[PDB]
DNA sequence: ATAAGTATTGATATAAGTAATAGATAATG
DNA sequence: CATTATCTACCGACAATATCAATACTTAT
């Protein structure tokens, strides 16, 4: 039943530990059954619903939806079993010459061995679930992309097969399916579903205007043109979309990867951690063999143990669904009216009056654009309502039980939960629902910090801590009113910046206000240490700036200084004088410029944002307040121009480090390795560039930028030819993306490293810790200890100069490379000349370096068939005349690191608050 | 007496933005005799010609010297070409305007707002006698503009609100091969069906001898197109060009449903109609089997269909009770974010 | 002593306001 | 040395196809 309330009822902590142990073992068994029997339980649930509905009657409702699911399954099982029958009847081949040239030749003999390995009902249910889940993705209006659907279903069947194998291996005591086989299997199964699924529909005949009802296919395979490049789509009947925006959707399409009720499998190797049976790799490596190869080398060497410590501390923190906030959101959802973010029930979009054909082409184009805008808004609201429905259903499932989230890393190292649907790292509603399972007494610091958190939520995070406490104290009546009745009241919590977390903390504060001694109260709501321009903090620390560090709350201060606000004010003053000057673009926008609008452009700007991106970012941020056209970008163009003009003067160290990183990335990307290749690829005089930017995280995790130039090809399926890319094809690197992406990835790696160090330390102290990249959460009691730990670990991360260590690591990894040199501009040092010759003898031992290198020169289209030929050719260049030379890659000189003790942050309380 | 620019002057212009023009006066005289424009515009002393993308302005000078229309508007918004036109046709009765003809707004401003060029609207039964439009859309990248100008005939909106205005269009040879393909040829696509449904277009002159291998043989015999060598166009880099006379005709289909049906059938232009009608919505094959009565038509792959069969299929599509929504036929590339 | 598919592959067209936007800018001849 | 075709900061994410011109390849007669 409800475990959380009874557990809280317990007076003594030891009793709590006994209760936790008993629930932990019973939840071990419960989680074990949950993973394997998810599909069987779901299929049994809908077949039961179908049988139950049969007695009552046959109307088009949610029970009918389940009836439809059991009917599609029931009439799809025979087709797939006939396919399996012909697969086993033909897997006993005799001669591979006279075969069915289409249906068996490439189709059935290719996927034959893969259909036998798994029983059919699992494949059918998986295809239905996985096709419904992809509803309205990939840009389709009310369907999915065919490539995404085929690959997702093939991958889900393969992964379910691998779960079956894991279970069989634990019970009794290909490796990675290629993309082509996954595509063929997925296409065949979704084809069968297309050819079985039929749903009743009602239509109006045109000539007589008499309604007619009929049965039509539930799924259909069509195509759609964008930008000239045709796209394949799978459209779902609108009658079924009406029923997917329904409360009972979660029963039909079950979530397999949901928060587990047992302690995650603690991370001991890159291959194992968190989830029990579904293997989860430590890196969300998208499409790279190199990324996993380097991670594997690291794990085998074992030098990343601190990453494991951070992930194990991040994962072992227990949550619980907030019951009161769940009640309020359920009331609001059932009410049906549009709330703060839940868009509200909508039947079908209304389009403006269509313009007459004879109108100027621009008018028709404008109307078509407006139709696209209206359709996008309607599909967005529908998707938001469906997502909220899914989230509220998962929340309803766990109303009492306590849950753990298993964390994983993307390729930089930031920690992202494994559960994609519902997690504390989603939008505001998801955060409001979750509270820390462990409750700790507030205490003297705790009560004040809880108040400061409530002030933070309401947008008053700018002012000093005392002002935040004063703000919380001044609005005690509002807190009691909002807490007593969420709705049918003043609704003060709604005005807050973060709407749901604000009500949750209001409930906590109301309980606190009813106690004579607040410290004795035990609290659950996590307090957020959000971080002011964290990327700027890291740039200032790396460069060693003093003025820059001062602006970014690094140095101890009485009042918090945030760069975004300062630049926003500067821009405001300049825009105000500009509007007075006489331009009309500024007068409308003179005031609206606030911290929120500027912050996105400033952050991206330090990171190398192209101007188009800045124009869009600002357009989206300023669209709500309605000071310019949300649709149009023309009004927003000037504003970004001024933002860039004001910003350029501000930044010096960040620009220096970003420029050095960009230059290093370009030079390293355009470099060619000596050792691996002793053969010219013969594609041309200029070989391909397959060397990628790689550096190590201060924790020891390896980071390899996977910005390659992907090679897609059309592999044939039963439905269509899908334009997919094979992950095993190694390809040259996209120099443009390497150069544009090194700075942000470096700063994000440093940010994630600081998080993992601080997480390991907090978990060592015994404080549960949850972190959304750059804001750390802990109970309002231990917030002071966490505050100490953050600063301390930042020190432990920046005690050593990191940019210099990175440049040294680059020089070590990329010493024996030979950057392709174009016509000369000047000389830097005097070892380039010895590079071309490689005639110095290497006798009696290693230092083979000349031997491998000289043969590479032979691959530079030497003037020969011989030995003294090319060496003579280059003598003129040094003595004069440009050539496409082979000079040794030389990384730039790092910027001068200004003198600034990073250790002065230990006494700044506004660094993280 | 308009002075015609020769190869000497037009050799001096360094930039052309990719447009290839023609400069030989002999082939232009031959072309204007082949077209025989003095049959429809019997009183040229009242005709008003609107020349889009004139460029070098040789066709314009020859046209004026032969017919003397009342108003000849050269809409060329390009630096070197505009300078050329103002240094050669200065004071000349030609009307040289520095206006981009690409943007729709140019026509609205010219005819509607400023009333510099005001032609006379006539009925939609005879090819207009007081308005002639000539255009040189020859850039290899600026082909979609021709498609927009063709689509305007269907809507009767852009310049075809003056009835049936005849167009003299220079165009890449690849565009002329697309537009002028007959049913079943290899180069038959939806551009060809649009051309067939809205216009009847003849090949007046081509810039190559080995290009006639892409057009229909009987139609190539019927048109009798003028030929010339590739040494006649002045920028001699790009592919050969082809002049096409394009006069709108009558039509009584629904242009929106016809667009949908044709665009979605001509995606799979080689699968027989047994299985290509399922891309037109949910349950398309069953319905279009119950409705189409001529089971010989069901074996014509949609590249084999003439336009009349497409009008028939769109009639069945608009008769469909369960027809899908024609207006939400796009991909929401703008903001399908998919946060969860 | 004597040829026709054929799995693989590569080019081209696709829609049509330069994808919902337009200034850099690395990269060939 | 003069002139142009890509994108538009990065991460969680998640992608153009049909057709046919022609190829190397195995069949085999
Ligand atoms: O668009 C973005 C947004 C954020 N980030 C990166 O995510 C991190 C924090 O993202 P945010 O906390 S929200 O934005 P802040 O820059 O921190 O403003 P604040 O001081 O909180 O008022 C931070 O490392 C930023 O560089 C991006 O890289 N790109
Ligand atoms: Mg932050």
Helix (H, G, I), strand (E, B) or coil at A714: strand
Helix (H, G, I), strand (E, B) or coil at A220: strand
Residue B95 lies inside a defined structural domain of this protein: yes
Task: Give A218's contacts in chain B (Cβ within 8 Å).
Answer: 282
Closest CA to A777 of A479, A447, A529: A529
Task: Give B268's contacts in chain A (Cβ within 8 Å).
Answer: 223
Cα angle A236, A242, A246; round to 5: 120
* A818 close to A889: Cβ distance less than 8 angstroms: yes
Helix (H, G, I), strand (E, B) or coil at A419: coil
Classify residue A190 by its DSSP letter: H
Q: In the structure, how far is the CA atom of residue A304 from the C1' atom of nucleotide C26, in angstroms?
A: 38
A204 Cα to chain B: minimum distance (Å): 5
Residue B331 lies inside a defined structural domain of this protein: no
B231 with B116, same domain: the answer is yes
The CATH number given to whatever domain includes residue B214 is 3.40.50.150
- Helix crossing, A534-543 with A783-798: angle to 10°? 40
Domain boundaries, chain A: 1-32, 37-254, 319-403, 440-523, 546-651, 818-888
Residue B282 lies inside a defined structural domain of this protein: yes
Task: Pick A440-523's CATH classification: 1.10.3710.10, 1.10.287.280, 3.10.580.10, 3.90.76.10.
Answer: 1.10.287.280
B59 with B178, same domain: the answer is yes
Task: Give A357's contacts in chain B (Cβ within 8 Å).
Answer: 155-157, 255
Check pocket membership of A533 for ligand 1, CB cut-off 6 A.
Answer: yes
Cα angle A711, A712, A713; round to 5: 125
Mutate to test the interface with A, among B264, B328, B337 (most CBs of A within 10 A): B328
- Cα A161 to chain centroid distance, Å, stands at 26
Task: Pick A319-403's CATH classification: 1.20.950, 3.90.1150, 1.10.3470, 1.10.287.
Answer: 1.10.287
Written as six digits, the tokens of A176 are 């990675």
Check pocket membership of A774 for ligand 1, CB cut-off 6 A.
Answer: yes
Residue B324 lies inside a defined structural domain of this protein: no
Alpha carbon distance A825, A58 (integer Å): 82
Check pocket membership of A446 for ligand 1, CB cut-off 6 A.
Answer: no
- Residue showing tokens 């390896």: A702
Q: What are phi and psi of B165, to 5 degrees?
A: -85, 135
Number of compact structural domains in chain B: 2
- Residue showing tokens 């194990």: A312
Alpha carbon distance A38, A60 (integer Å): 26
B206 with B295, same domain: the answer is no
Residue B117 lies inside a defined structural domain of this protein: yes
Helix (H, G, I), strand (E, B) or coil at A301: helix
Tell me whether residues A230 and B267 touch, CB distance under 8 A.
yes
Helix (H, G, I), strand (E, B) or coil at A280: coil
Tell me whether residues A223 and B279 touch, CB distance under 8 A.
yes
A723: left (phi over 0), alpha (psi -120 to 50) or beta: beta
Q: In the structure, how far is the CA atom of residue A105 from the C1' atom of nucleotide D4, in angstroms?
A: 47
Which ligand is nearest to the Cα of residue A617, counting in written order?
A: 1
Residues in chain A: 913
Q: Tell me whether residue B197 is exposed, middle or buried, using C-beta atoms within 10 angstroms of its C-beta: 0 to 12, 13 to 18, 19 or more.
A: buried
For residues B153-188, one letter each, b for 16 or more C-beta atoms within 10 angstroms of the residue's C-beta and e for the rest, the string is bbbbbbbbbbbbbbbbbbbbbbbbbbbbbebeeebb
Q: Return the C-alpha torsion angle A338, A343, A344, A350, nearest 10.
A: 110
Name the residue with the closest Cα to ligand 1, atom 21: A532
Please give the number of the atom of ligand 1 that sits closest to the Cα of A599: 18
Residues 698-737 of A with CB under 7 A from strand C: 735-736
Domain of B308 in residue numbering reads as 255-319
B169 with B308, same domain: the answer is no
Residues 62-91 of B with CB under 7 A from strand C: none
* Number of Cβ within a 10 Å radius of residue B208: 16
Cα angle A367, A371, A376; round to 5: 150
Mutate to test the interface with A, among B111, B266, B282 (most CBs of A within 10 A): B282
Task: Tell me, in angstroms, the distance from the centre of ligand 2 to residue A311's CA.
Answer: 21
**DSSP state letters, A569-618:** HHHHHHHHHHHHHT-HHHHHHTTT--HHHHHHHHHHHHT---HHHHHHHH
B217 with B267, same domain: the answer is no
Q: Tell me whether residue B134 is exposed, middle or buried, using C-beta atoms within 10 angstroms of its C-beta: 0 to 12, 13 to 18, 19 or more.
A: buried
Residue B314 lies inside a defined structural domain of this protein: yes
Residues in chain B: 340
Q: How was this one solved?
A: cryo-EM
Closest CA to B146 of B222, B230, B259, B246: B246
Bases of chain D below 7 A from a protein C-beta are: 1, 3, 7-21, 27-28
Q: Which residues contact A475 (CB under 8 A, 6 or more apart)?
A: A492
* A281 close to A731: Cβ distance less than 8 angstroms: no
Mutate to test the interface with A, among B109, B277, B332, B338 (most CBs of A within 10 A): B332
Residue B67 lies inside a defined structural domain of this protein: yes
Instruction: Map chain B to HEC letters.
Output: CCCCCCHHHHCCCCCCCCCCCECCHHHHHHHHHHHCHHHCCCCHHHCEEEEECCCCCHHHHHHHHHHCCCEEEEECCCHHHHHHHHHHCCCCCCEEECCCCCCHHHHHHHHHHHCCCCCCCCCCCCEEEEEEEEEECCCCCCCHHHHHHHHHHHHCCCCHHHCEEEEEEEEEHHHHHHHCCCCCCCCCCHHHHHHHHHEEEEEEEECCCCCHHHCCHHHHHHHCCEECCCCCECCCCCCCEEEEEEEECCCCCCHHHHHHHHHHHCCCCCCCCCCCHHHHCCCHHHHHHHHCCCCCHHHCCCCCCCHHHHHHHHHHHHHCCCCCCCCCCCCCCCCCCCCC
Classify residue A356 by its DSSP letter: P
Return the best residue to mutate from A428, A529, A774, A776 for the ligand 1 pocket (most ligand atoms within 8 A of CB). A774
Give Rg (Cα) of chain B: 22
* B40 close to B64: Cβ distance less than 8 angstroms: no
Closest CA to A524 of A344, A662, A317: A317
- Nucleic strand C near CB of residue A634 (< 7 Å): yes
B23 with B153, same domain: the answer is yes
Alpha carbon distance B312, A819 (integer Å): 65
- Nucleic strand C near CB of residue B333 (< 7 Å): yes
Q: In the structure, how far is the CA atom of residue A819 from the C1' atom of nucleotide D21, in angstroms?
A: 40
A422 Cα to chain B: minimum distance (Å): 8
Cα angle A652, A653, A656; round to 5: 90
* A911 close to A790: Cβ distance less than 8 angstroms: yes
Residue closest to sugar C1' of C21 by CA: A633
Residue ranges for the known binding site of B are 22, 76, 100, 136
Considering CB atoms only, which of A136, A141, A362 is closest to B104?
A: A362
B21 with B147, same domain: the answer is yes
Q: What are phi and psi of A391, to 5 degrees?
A: -65, -40
* Number of Cβ within a 10 Å radius of residue B8: 7
Q: What share of chain A is helix, strand, coil (3-state, %, to 5)?
A: 55, 10, 35
Tell me whether residues B278 and A207 touch, CB distance under 8 A.
no
Q: Which residues make beta-bridge pairs with A172?
A: none
User: Resolution reached, in Å?
Assistant: 3.7
Considering CB atoms only, which of A204, A217, A383 is closest to B282?
A: A217
B12 with B146, same domain: the answer is yes
**DSSP state letters, A776-835:** EEEESSTHHHHHHHHHHHHHHHHSS-HHHHHHHHHHHHTTTEEEEE-S------SSHHHH
CA distances from A822 to A520, A619, A681 (A): 74, 42, 20
* B149 close to B198: Cβ distance less than 8 angstroms: no
B265 with B201, same domain: the answer is no
Beta strands (DSSP E) in A28-110 are none
Written as six digits, the tokens of A448 are 């004040």
Task: Give A221's contacts in chain B (Cβ within 8 Å).
Answer: 278-279
Name the residue with the closest Cα to ligand 1, atom 10: A774
List A residues 190-209 in contact with B (Cβ-Cβ < 8 A).
Answer: 201, 203-207
Considering CB atoms only, which of A360, A371, A390 is closest to B340?
A: A390
Alpha carbon distance A393, A382 (integer Å): 16
* B131 close to B48: Cβ distance less than 8 angstroms: yes
* Number of Cβ within a 10 Å radius of residue A470: 15
Written as six digits, the tokens of A257 are 């990867």
Task: Give B331's contacts in chain A (Cβ within 8 Å).
Answer: 139-141, 224, 226, 231, 233
B73 with B116, same domain: the answer is yes
Residue B335 lies inside a defined structural domain of this protein: no
Alpha carbon distance B146, B144 (integer Å): 5
Task: Tell me, in angstroms, the distance from the centre of ligand 2 to residue A620's CA.
Answer: 19
The CATH number given to whatever domain includes residue B300 is 1.10.8.100
Check pocket membership of A531 for ligand 1, CB cut-off 6 A.
Answer: yes
Active site residues of A: 530, 599, 774
Helix (H, G, I), strand (E, B) or coil at A24: helix
B140 with B90, same domain: the answer is yes
Helix (H, G, I), strand (E, B) or coil at A413: coil
Helix (H, G, I), strand (E, B) or coil at A94: coil
Name the residue with the closest Cα to ligand 1, atom 29: A604
- Nucleic strand C near CB of residue A637 (< 7 Å): yes
Q: Which nucleotide is nearest to B148 (CA to C1')?
A: C16
Residue closest to sugar C1' of D26 by CA: A97
CA distances from B207 to A466, B147, B203, B210 (A): 83, 22, 11, 9
Alpha carbon distance B173, B215 (integer Å): 11
B88 Cα to chain A: minimum distance (Å): 34
Tell me whether residues A375 and B328 touch, CB distance under 8 A.
yes
Task: Give A239's contacts in chain B (Cβ within 8 Å).
Answer: none
Alpha carbon distance A218, A135 (integer Å): 13
* A708 close to A733: Cβ distance less than 8 angstroms: yes
Does this chain's domain A319-403 share its CATH topology with A440-523? yes
């Amino acid at each position: 039943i409800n475990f959380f309330e009874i557990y809280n009822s317990l007076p003594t902590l030891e009793e709590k530990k006994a209760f936790e142990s008993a629930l932990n073992i019973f939840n071990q068994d419960r989680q074990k059954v949950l993973e394997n029997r998810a599909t069987e339980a779901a299929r049994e649930r809908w077949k039961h619903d179908f049988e139950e509905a049969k007695a009552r009657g046959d109307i088009s409702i949610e029970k009918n939806l389940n009836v439809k699911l059991w009917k599609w399954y029931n009439e799809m099982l025979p087709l797939v079993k006939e396919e399996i029958n012909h697969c086993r009847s033909l897997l006993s081949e005799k001669l591979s010459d006279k075969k069915g040239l289409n249906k068996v030749d490439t189709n059935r003999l290719g996927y034959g061995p893969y259909l036998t390995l798994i029983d059919p009902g699992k494949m059918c249910v998986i295809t239905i679930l996985e096709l419904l889940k992809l509803n309205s993705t990939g840009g389709v209006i009310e369907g999915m992309r065919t490539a995404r659907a085929v690959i997702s279903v093939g991958k889900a069947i393969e992964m379910e097969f691998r779960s079956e194998q894991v279970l069989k291996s634990e019970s009794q005591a290909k490796i990675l399916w290629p993309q082509s086989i996954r595509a063929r299997i997925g296409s065949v199964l979704i084809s069968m579903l297309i050819q079985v699924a039929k749903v009743s529909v009602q239509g109006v005949d045109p000539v007589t205007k008499a309604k007619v009802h009929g049965e039509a296919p539930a799924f259909a395979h069509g195509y759609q043109y964008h930008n000239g490049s045709k796209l394949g789509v799978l459209k779902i009947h609108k009658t079924l979309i009406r029923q997917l925006n329904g409360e009972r959707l979660i029963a039909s399409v079950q979530p397999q990867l949901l928060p587990m009720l047992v302690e995650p499998k603690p991370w001991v190797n890159w291959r194992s951690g968190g989830y029990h049976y579904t293997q989860s790799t430590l890196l969300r490596t998208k499409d790279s063999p190199e990324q996993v190869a380097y991670l594997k080398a690291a794990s085998d060497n074992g030098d990343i143990d601190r990453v494991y410590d951070g992930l194990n501390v991040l994962g072992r923190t227990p949550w619980t669904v907030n019951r009161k906030v769940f009640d309020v959101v359920s009331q609001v959802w059932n009410k049906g009216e549009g709330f703060l973010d839940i868009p509200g029930a909508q039947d079908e979009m209304v389009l403006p009056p269509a313009p007459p054909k004879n109108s100027d082409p621009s008018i028709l184009r404008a109307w078509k654009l407006q139709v696209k805008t209206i359709a996008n808004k309607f599909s967005s609201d529908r998707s938001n309502r469906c997502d909220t429905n899914y989230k509220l259903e998962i929340a309803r499932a766990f109303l009492g039980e306590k849950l753990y989230f298993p964390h994983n890393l993307d390729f930089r190292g930031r920690a992202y939960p494994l559960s994609p649907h519902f997690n504390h790292l989603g939008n505001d509603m998801s955060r409001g629902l979750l509270i820390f399972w462990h409750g700790k007494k507030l205490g003297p610091s705790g009560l004040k910090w809880l108040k400061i958190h409530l002030s933070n939520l309401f947008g008053f995070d700018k002012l000093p801590l005392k002002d935040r406490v004063a703000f919380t104290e001044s609005h005690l009546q509002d807190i009691k009113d909002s807490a007593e009745n969420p709705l049918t009241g003043d609704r003060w919590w709604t005005t807050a910046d973060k709407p749901w977390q604000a009500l949750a903390t209001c409930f906590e504060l109301n309980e606190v206000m009813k106690m004579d001694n607040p410290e004795e109260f035990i609290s659950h709501q996590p307090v957020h240490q959000d971080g002011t321009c964290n990327g700027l903090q890291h740039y200032a620390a790396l460069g060693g700036d003093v003025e820059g560090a001062t602006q970014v709350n690094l140095v101890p201060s009485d009042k918090p200084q945030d760069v975004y606000a300062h630049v926003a004010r500067l821009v405001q003053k300049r825009l105000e004088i500009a509007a007075e000057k006489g331009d009309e673009n500024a007068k409308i926008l003179k005031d609206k410029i606030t911290r929120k609008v500027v912050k996105q452009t400033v952050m991206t700007n330090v990171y190398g944002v192209t101007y188009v991106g800045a124009t869009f970012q600002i357009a989206k941020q300023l669209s709500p307040i309605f000071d310019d056209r949300k649709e149009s970008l023309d009004f927003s163009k000037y504003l970004t121009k001024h933002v860039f003009s004001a910003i350029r003067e501000l930044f010096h160290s960040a620009h220096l480090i970003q420029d050095w990183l960009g230059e290093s990335a370009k030079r390293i990307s355009k470099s060619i390795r000596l050792d691996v290749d002793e053969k010219s690829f013969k594609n041309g005089n200029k070989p391909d560039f397959m060397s990628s930017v790689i550096w190590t995280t201060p924790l020891g995790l390896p980071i390899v930028q996977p910005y390659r130039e992907e090679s897609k090809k059309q592999v044939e399926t039963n439905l269509q030819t899908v334009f997919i890319s094979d992950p095993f094809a190694v390809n040259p690197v996209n120099a443009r993306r390497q150069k544009a992406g090194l700075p942000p990835n470096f700063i994000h790696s440093l940010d994630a490293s600081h998080m993992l160090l601080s997480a390991a330390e907090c978990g060592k102290q015994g404080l549960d810790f949850a972190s959304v990249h750059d804001s750390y959460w802990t109970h309002a009691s231990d917030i002071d200890t966490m505050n100490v730990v953050l600063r301390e670990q930042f020190i432990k991360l920046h005690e050593v100069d990191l940019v210099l260590r990175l440049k040294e690591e680059f020089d070590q990894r990329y010493k024996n490379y030979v950057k392709i040199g174009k016509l000369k501009r000047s000389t830097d040092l005097a070892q380039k000349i010895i590079r071309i010759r490689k005639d110095l003898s290497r006798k009696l031992g290693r230092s083979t370096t000349l031997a491998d290198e000289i043969y590479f020169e032979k691959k530079r289209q030497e003037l020969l068939n011989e030995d003294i030929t090319d060496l003579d050719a280059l003598e003129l260049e040094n003595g004069n005349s440009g050539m496409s030379v082979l000079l040794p890659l030389r990384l730039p000189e790092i910027p001068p690191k200004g003198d600034f003790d990073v250790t002065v942050l230990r006494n700044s309380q506004y660094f993280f608050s | 007496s308009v002075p015609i620019p020769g190869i000497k002057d037009i050799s001096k212009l360094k930039f052309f933005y990719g447009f290839k023009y023609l400069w030989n006066p002999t082939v232009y005289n031959k072309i204007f005799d082949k077209l025989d424009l003095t049959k429809t515009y019997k009183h040229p002393e009242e005709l008003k010609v609107l020349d889009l993308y004139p460029g070098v302005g040789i066709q314009s000078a020859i046209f004026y010297n032969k017919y003397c229309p009342r108003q000849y508007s050269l809409l060329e918004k390009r630096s070197s070409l505009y300078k050329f036109l103002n240094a050669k046709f200065e004071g000349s009765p030609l009307q040289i305007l520095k206006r981009d003809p690409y943007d729709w707004s140019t026509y609205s401003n010219l005819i509607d707002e400023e009333r510099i060029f005001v032609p006379e609207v006539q009925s939609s039964d005879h090819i207009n006698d007081k308005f002639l439009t000539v255009a040189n859309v020859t850039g290899e990248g600026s082909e979609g503009l021709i498609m927009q100008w063709l689509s305007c005939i269907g809507n009767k909106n852009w310049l075809y609100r003056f009835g049936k205005v005849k167009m003299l269009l220079w165009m890449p040879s690849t565009t002329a091969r697309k537009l002028l393909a007959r049913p079943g040829m290899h180069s038959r696509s939806k551009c060809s069906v649009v051309r067939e449904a809205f216009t009847d277009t003849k090949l007046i002159a081509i810039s190559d001898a080995n290009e006639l291998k892409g057009f229909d043989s009987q139609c190539i015999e019927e048109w009798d197109p003028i030929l010339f060598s590739a040494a006649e166009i002045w920028p001699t880099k790009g592919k050969p060009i082809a002049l096409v006379e394009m006069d709108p005709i009558d039509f009584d289909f629904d242009v929106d449903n016809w667009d949908y049906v044709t665009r979605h059938l001509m995606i799979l232009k080689r699968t027989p109609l047994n299985t290509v009608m399922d891309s037109l919505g949910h349950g398309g094959q069953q319905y279009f089997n119950s409705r189409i009565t001529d089971k010989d038509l069901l074996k014509k792959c949609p590249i084999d269909l003439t336009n009349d069969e497409f009008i028939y299929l769109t009639k069945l599509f608009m008769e469909w009770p369960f027809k899908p929504d024609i207006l939400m036929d796009f991909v929401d590339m703008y903001q399908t974010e998919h946060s969860g």
